[PDB]
């Protein structure tokens, strides 16, 4: 369900349903998640750092 991503010294828990657009750029995977009344926050997660759920959809399903 939830993705724990490091910020400075604070690891932030964000839901898989709230990730609006996800894209694999090269060494990193950048993503725009929505959070309230039309105001999108922008996170990032590395290639070894991202575990299994987001990796299976873009290189198997459709």
Task: Sketch the domain layout of the chain as residue ranges.
Answer: 1-62
By C-alpha distance, which of 11, 12, 10 is closest to 33? 12
Burial class of 3 by CB neighbour count within 10 A (0 to 12, 13 to 18, 19+): buried
Cα–Cα distance list, 26 to 12, 34, 42, 46 (Å): 23, 23, 17, 9
Spatial neighbors of 31 by CB under 8 A, at least 6 apart, are 19, 21, 22, 23, 42, 43, 44, 45
- What's the rounded Cα separation, in Å, for the pair 62 and 56? 10
Burial class of 31 by CB neighbour count within 10 A (0 to 12, 13 to 18, 19+): buried
Phi, psi of 60 (to 5 degrees): -165, -60
| Residue owning tokens 């939830």 | 2
User: Which CATH entry fits the domain spanning 1-62: 3.10.20.340, 2.170.120.20, 2.40.50.250, 2.40.50.40?
Assistant: 2.40.50.40
Give the determination technique. Answer: NMR
Question: How many other CB atoms are there within 10 angstroms of residue 9's CB atom?
Answer: 5
By C-alpha distance, which of 34, 30, 39 is closest to 20? 34
């Amino acid at each position: 369900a939830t993705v724990k991503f490091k910020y400075k010294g604070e690891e932030k828990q964000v839901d898989i349903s709230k990730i609006k657009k996800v894209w694999r750029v090269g060494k990193m995977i950048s993503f725009t998640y929505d959070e309230g009344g039309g105001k999108t926050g922008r996170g990032a997660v590395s290639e070894k750092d991202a575990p299994k759920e987001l990796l299976q959809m873009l290189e198997k399903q459709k």
